[PDB]
Amino acid sequence: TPSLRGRLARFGNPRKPVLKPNKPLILANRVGERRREKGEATCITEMSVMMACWKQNEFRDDACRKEIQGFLDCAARAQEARKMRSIQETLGESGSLLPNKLNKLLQRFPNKPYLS
Amino acid sequence: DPPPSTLLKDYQNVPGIEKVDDVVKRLLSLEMANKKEMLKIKQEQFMKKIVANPEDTRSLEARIIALSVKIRSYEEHLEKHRKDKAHKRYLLMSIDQRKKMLKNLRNTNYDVFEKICWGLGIEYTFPPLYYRRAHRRFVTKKALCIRVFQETQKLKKRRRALKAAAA
């Protein structure tokens, strides 16, 4: 962990400040939400193969059946994988813990930046 | 400056240093050392020349001598680096500090102060009472006032001759 001694601008700190945070460097009792990953267009390569075969075969499906089937299978796999990814996000196995359970854990042991 | 063949301050007081090879003497000479060794030799020479106790370094005289050596080094540095504002500031501040030290020494011990001034060639000058801008108008008016005073002195001198002759 990087040192904080003599970094912030404080009384008794002779040097000019190193860090100028816009928020206090105090741990919050919550973590950020499970940020979604912006979806990218999928099955582009199979679509390209199918379209190139269409261009070579004058958009005749009979000749291109194999590539068309490959593109369709890739599209179905992508849709089913999106559904499975939603299921996995609900499960939370990939991460060490879901943000909700982590927020509960931090609620159980809150930060104490004050005296009592 | 001390001759380049002069041994270093540390090595000049080791026994048998005169019986070593000339190469060894070269290595331990000021020739084969940086300028700060020469400054230390100069400081030692000045202490032996001036102060009553050459072994005392906390005395005001020792501080004045060391600051004088530093000032000389700064001037030598600035003669080559004339655009070194940091060392220009160091030289000016050291000059002011030496003036303060000389004022204190003069107030405390006058005979030793005279010895310091003579040995180090310091011409202690009292600061002027008023530090005010001498702009063009003020300089011109001061010059004219001095010239007018001189002319009035000439006229007053000449006024006496006619009165003396008439009487």
Binding site: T1, S3, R5, L8, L25, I26, P113 | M32
Partner: protein, 122 residues
């Protein structure tokens, strides 16, 4: 002071390398340096191509010249090495053995900084 001239010479046959080393050490002595040792690091392929005196060098012979020279001779020796054609690259440093290594007790741990913000409730 004590200097170490790290020298990269053009990959040549033994007579030419000997002549170049002799010329360099003689120049050092003429400028006033007392040469203490000449250490050969061998001939090796350069880490990167060096263009010196309109010639691209891929291999070079590495030597070290430890010496004691007056401070004024370093600039003159740098100029002389710049003018030399047999020297791929020459750099004079202050001798690393001169700087004594201060003893280190160990890595002193840095405790987490405290009392950076007032303990008032937020």
């Amino acid at each position: 002071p004590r200097y170490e001239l790290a020298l990269i010479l053009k990959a040549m046959q033994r007579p030419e390398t000997a002549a170049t080393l002799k010329r360099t050490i003689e120049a050092l002595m003429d400028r006033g340096a007392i040469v203490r040792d000449l250490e050969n690091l061998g001939e090796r392929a350069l880490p990167y191509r060096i263009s010196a005196h309109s010639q691209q060098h891929n291999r070079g012979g590495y030597f070290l010249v430890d010496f004691y020279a007056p401070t004024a001779a370093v600039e003159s020796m740098v100029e002389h090495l710049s003018r030399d054609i047999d020297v791929i690259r020459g750099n004079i440093v202050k001798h690393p053995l001169t700087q004594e290594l201060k003893e280190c007790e160990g890595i002193v741990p840095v405790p987490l900084a405290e009392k950076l913000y007032s303990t008032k409730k937020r």
